[PDB]
Each structure stands twice: as structure tokens, then as C-alpha cells.
Design a protein around this ligand. Structure first.
Ligand SMILES: Fc1ccccc1NCc1cc[nH]n1
Length: 119
């Protein structure tokens, strides 16, 4: 029933993601000195520190907004990868599976709580 519970749930999920070794390439913005043409392919950079900071600033209204930004981290990795077998891309697929497995109940509980609020 709690319309605000998603925020702490997302904080705890981001804590789990930061503990995951697979998140290391995604914890901070992609370095343009390491990948000079990054912005020629990727229009909207995103990373987990920017997601956490947006959440902690009170700049997400719902877990769907957070989920859209986290998914952008993974679609950027898929768009920039030179191969479907690359190391960083392979790490993003596992991390995406972990994130989707955990965010599902957060989204369901929030949407259910909001429907109850507007009943
Ligand atoms: F070299 C790559 C292979 C596959 C996906 C992404 C990259 N480089 C960009 C990046 C993203 C996060 N860390 N570095």
C-alpha cells in the first residue's frame, strides 16, 4: 500500500548493484579519453552514480523513471559494443538480468499502491 516504499527499495537495489563486480564499468560516466568516439554513437550517457544521485536528490517521481535510466545504461552498452561477445557488454547483460529480476516487484508494488490510492 505504501506509495513511497519504492525509494528505499531502489536505494537497496543500487547498493546491491554497486557490490556486484559486473557493475564496475557502469559505476561512473564512460571516460571519453578511453573511448574517444563514444558521443558519436551515444546521445545520452548514463551510469549508476548518476542514477543514485538523481534518486538521492529527490529527482525521481517514480521507480519507472529510475528503471528507464537504468535501462539506458544497458542499451548504451549494447549500442556501443563492437561485438555481442565483448567483455563489457557481457557484464552488462548479466547485470541487466539481475536488475530486471529485482526491479519487477518494486514496479509491481508501486503501481498496485498507486492504484489503491486512486481507487
Ligand atoms: F568497450 C566497450 C565494449 C562494450 C560496451 C561498451 C564499451 N565501452 C564503453 C564503456 C561502457 C562502460 N564502460 N566502458
Amino acid at each position: 500500500y505504501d506509495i513511497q516504499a519504492w525509494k528505499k527499495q531502489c536505494e537497496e537495489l543500487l547498493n546491491l548493484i554497486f557490490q556486484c563486480e559486473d557493475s564496475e564499468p557502469f559505476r561512473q560516466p564512460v571516460d571519453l579519453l578511453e573511448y574517444p568516439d563514444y558521443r558519436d554513437i551515444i546521445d545520452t550517457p548514463m551510469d549508476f552514480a548518476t542514477v543514485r544521485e538523481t534518486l538521492e536528490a529527490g529527482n525521481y517521481e517514480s521507480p519507472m523513471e529510475l528503471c528507464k535510466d537504468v535501462r539506458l545504461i544497458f542499451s548504451n552498452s549494447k549500442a556501443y559494443t563492437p561485438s555481442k561477445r565483448s567483455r563489457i557488454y557481457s557484464m552488462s547483460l548479466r547485470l541487466s538480468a539481475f536488475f530486471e529480476e529485482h526491479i519487477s516487484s518494486v514496479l509491481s508494488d508501486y503501481k498496485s499502491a498507486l492504484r489503491f490510492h486512486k481507487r
